Amino acid sequence: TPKESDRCGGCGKFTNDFQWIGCDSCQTWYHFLCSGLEQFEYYLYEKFFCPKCVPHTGHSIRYKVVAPHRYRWYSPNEKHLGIEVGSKTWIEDFITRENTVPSPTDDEVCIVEDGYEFRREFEKLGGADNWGKVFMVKDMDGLNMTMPKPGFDLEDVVKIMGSDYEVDTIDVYNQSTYSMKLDTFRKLFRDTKNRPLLYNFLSLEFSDNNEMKEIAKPPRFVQEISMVNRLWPDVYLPEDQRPKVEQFCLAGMAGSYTDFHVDFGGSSVYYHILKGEKIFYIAAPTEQNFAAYQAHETSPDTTTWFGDIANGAVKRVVIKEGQTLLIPAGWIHAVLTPVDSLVFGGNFLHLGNLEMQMRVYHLENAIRKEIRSEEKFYFPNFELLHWMYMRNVLLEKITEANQEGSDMREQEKNIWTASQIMKAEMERWMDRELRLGPEKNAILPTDDKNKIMISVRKQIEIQTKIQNAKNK
Numbered sequence: 001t002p003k004e005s006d007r008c009g010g011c012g013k014f015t016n017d018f019q020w021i022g023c024d025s026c027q028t029w030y031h032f033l034c035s036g037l038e039q040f041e042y043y044l045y046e047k048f049f050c051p052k053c054v055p056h057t058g059h060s061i062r063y064k065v066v067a068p069h070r071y072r073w074y075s076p077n078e079k080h081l082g083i084e085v086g087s088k089t090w091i092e093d094f095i096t097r098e099n100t101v102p103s104p105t106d107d108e109v110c111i112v113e114d115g116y117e118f119r120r121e122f123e124k125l126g127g128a129d130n131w132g133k134v135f136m137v138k139d140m141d142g143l144n145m146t147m148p149k150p151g152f153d154l155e156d157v158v159k160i161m162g163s164d165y166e167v168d169t170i171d172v173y174n175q176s177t178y179s180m181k182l183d184t185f186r187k188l189f190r191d192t193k194n195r196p197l198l199y200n201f202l203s204l205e206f207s208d209n210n211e212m213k214e215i216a217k218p219p220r221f222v223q224e225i226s227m228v229n230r231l232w233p234d235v236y237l238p239e240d241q242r243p244k245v246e247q248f249c250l251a252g253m254a255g256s257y258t259d260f261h262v263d264f265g266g267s268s269v270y271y272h273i274l275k276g277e278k279i280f281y282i283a284a285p286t287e288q289n290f291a292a293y294q295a296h297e298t299s300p301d302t303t304t305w306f307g308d309i310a311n312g313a314v315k316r317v318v319i320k321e322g323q324t325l326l327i328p329a330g331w332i333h334a335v336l337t338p339v340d341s342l343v344f345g346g347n348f349l350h351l352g353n354l355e356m357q358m359r360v361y362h363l364e365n366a367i368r369k370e371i372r373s374e375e376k377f378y379f380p381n382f383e384l385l386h387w388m389y390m391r392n393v394l395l396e397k398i399t400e401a402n403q404e405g406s407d408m409r410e411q412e413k414n415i416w417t418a419s420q421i422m423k424a425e426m427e428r429w430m431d432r433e434l435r436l437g438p439e440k441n442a443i444l445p446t447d448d449k450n451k452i453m454i455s456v457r458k459q460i461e462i463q464t465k466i467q468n469a470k471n472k
């Protein structure tokens with residue numbers, strides 16, 4: 001392979017993007033990033049012909065599929081090993097037995113005819129402050145959720161986003177994530193008979209695209225409770241700090257499988273199925289389920305489906321075209337996409353699930369500490385967002401109540417209880433940071449954090465005395 005003296009034929013600079021591949025014809029060497037290859041192709045070709053050579057050599061030659069039941073499907077050294085979850089072989093089998101996973105109880109999932117029935121049922125169960133079960137809504141009428149007119153599809157997405165827009169795409173059989181241009185995904189998607197590999201994107205975030213951001217929006221009730229929306233309203237606080245996760249477009253090939261996970265930061269999500277179908281395998285956020293999921297995530301084993309060792313916790317919910325799925329914090333889920341699909345969805349945090357949010361946060365942190373793969377990613381600016389919400393929103397409310405001599409439990413009890421819960425988690429962050437220094441990714445200076453905490457402590461103490469002053 002490449003020695004000190006050879007030139008990248010792309011950038012002409014000398015000695016994964018920045019690893020090397022050589023053209024089997026030219027013999028010239030390239031940085032992967034300079035080779036003309038997209039990231040999802042880096043590992044695909046056994047014989048690589050660079051773009052200067054293709055006109056006379058024909059296309060690069062891919063590795064032969066030798067181990068369809070392994071992530072490393074190109075490795076003869078793995079033919080003998082066990083079938084890995086998510087591999088082509090595993091999925092083709094799972095499809096035949098998946099409909100035998102039990103349906104969920106009425107306590108776990110509520111199916112309703114439309115948004116009006118959703119609103120009734122939601123409120124009957126306590127509203128957002130008490131949101132604890134999954135909802136599937138058959139018709140979006142009444143959800144007050146802006147979605148594109150049916151028929152709308154990938155073609156229109158690439159038209160709006162642009163052909164060269166990069167999307168983080170799951171190589172399903174390899175169970176790994178690589179960037180791929182939207183137009184490239186479009187090309188592979190529209191080729192229905194030739195699918196050596198399956199692709200699935202989950203994270204095309206379009207909230208900063210002026211055209212798209214108007215086409216597809218969260219249900220109004222989500223906008224009303226989203227903590228990010230409260231802090232960075234429709235448009236103080238830098239735009240480049242906003243967690244950008246509330247407007248995602250998702251598209252997947254038939255057969256695609258996403259393995260069990262809890263959404264990052266313990267966020268809640270909505271999904272509207274514009275085209276196709278999704279099947280969710282879900283388990284409720286109990287302490288026992290978390291522990292079992294934690295064990296599963298930290299195990300080196302790749303052959304056991306979580307559903308099979310979850311003591312019957314995993315349930316099956318089908319969501320078909322035109323239907324909408326709403327999941328609160330902490331639900332453990334895997335997803336199969338049985339048919340080519342186009343989906344709009346998004347993640348959000350809200351005060352009503354604050355406790356569960358922090359529990360998922362602790363789980364995440366526990367898992368992180370034990371496995372060496374930060375390729376999993378977590379809620380962007382999670383901690384920062386809380387410092388800002390405490391300071392700009394919660395502290396403000398407590399202070400105003402204190403100046404008015406008001407007992408918050410009367411008209412603002414939820415604000416008061418959320419503050420206490422948020423504060424206790426933030427005391428823990430503060431201590432950690434005074435003990436170990438800032439995080440790698442810390443925007444707020446240690447000192448600014450301390451000023452906020454000093455002020456929070458004080459107003460909490462003042463409100464507590466106001467509440468006690470009614471004692472006799």
Ligand SMILES: O=C(O)CCC(=O)C(=O)O
Nearest residue numbers: 202250257258263278335
């Ligand atoms: O549709 C999929 O494959 C995965 C959806 C999901 O659970 C996620 O994006 O968080």
Ligand SMILES: [Fe+2]
Nearest residue numbers: 261262263333
């Ligand atoms: Fe998810």
Ligand SMILES: [Zn+2]
Nearest residue numbers: 008011031034
């Ligand atoms: Zn280069």
Ligand SMILES: [Zn+2]
Nearest residue numbers: 023026050053
């Ligand atoms: Zn060449």
